[PDB]
Amino acid sequence: GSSGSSGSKSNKIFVGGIPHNCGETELREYFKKFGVVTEVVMIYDAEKQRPRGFGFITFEDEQSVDQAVNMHFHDIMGKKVEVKRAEPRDSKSSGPSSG
Numbered sequence: 259g260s261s262g263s264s265g266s267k268s269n270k271i272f273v274g275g276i277p278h279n280c281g282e283t284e285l286r287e288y289f290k291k292f293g294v295v296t297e298v299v300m301i302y303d304a305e306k307q308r309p310r311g312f313g314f315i316t317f318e319d320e321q322s323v324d325q326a327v328n329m330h331f332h333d334i335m336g337k338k339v340e341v342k343r344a345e346p347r348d349s350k351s352s353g354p355s356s357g
Contacts, residue, residue, distance in 0.1 A: 259300070259301075259311040259314075260297065260299075261310065263316075263346075263350065267320045267345060267346060268320075268344070268346040269296070269316050269317040269318065269319060269320045269322070269323050270297075270299070270314050270315065270316045270323070270344040270345075270346065270354065271314060271315050271316075271322075271323050271326050271327065271341055271342070271343065271344050272313075272314050272342045273285065273312065273313055273314060273315055273339060273340070273341050273344070273345040274311070274312040274313075274339075274340045274341075274342070275311060275312065275339055275340040276309060276310075276311040276312055276313065276334075276337075276338075276339050277334065277335055277336075277337035277339070278309060278311060279308075280309075280335050280337065280339065281300075281332045281333045282298045282300065284334055284335060285298055285315060285334070286298055286340060287320075288332060288334050288346060289315055289326065290318070292317070292322045292325040292326050293318055293319055293322030293325065294310070294316060294317060294318035294319070294322070295314070295315060295316070295317060295318075295322075296316050296318050297316035298313075298315050298316070299313050299314040299315060299316070300313035301313045301314075305338075314344050315327075321324075323343060323344075324343075326341045327341060327342060327343045329341065330342065340356075346354050
C-alpha cells in the first residue's frame with residue numbers, strides 16, 4: 259500500500275475473503291478484465307509478509323470499480339472473493355512550518 263493519489267476520483271475497491279493462494283499477480287490478472295489495475299493494496303503483518311485474505315485494489319477508471327462492486331463476487335483459484343465499493347481515506351494534514 260502506497261500513499262500518493264491526486265485523481266479526485268477514488269477508483270479503489272475493497273477485496274475481502276481472498277484465499278491464501280491468491281496474490282497481487284492473480285488479483286490483477288483477474289481484475290484486468292474489468293478494466294486496468296493501476297495499484298494493488300494488500301493488508302498483512304510485515305513479520306509474516308503475506309496477505310491473509312483481504313485488502314484493496316485501485317483501477318484506472320472509476321468504472322472498473324462499479325463493474326466489480328456489482329458482481330460482489332469472483333472465482334479466483336477456486337475461491338469466492340468478495341468485492342465492495344471502497345472509499346478514500348488518509349491520515350495526513352497540511353502544516354504551516356516547523357514546530
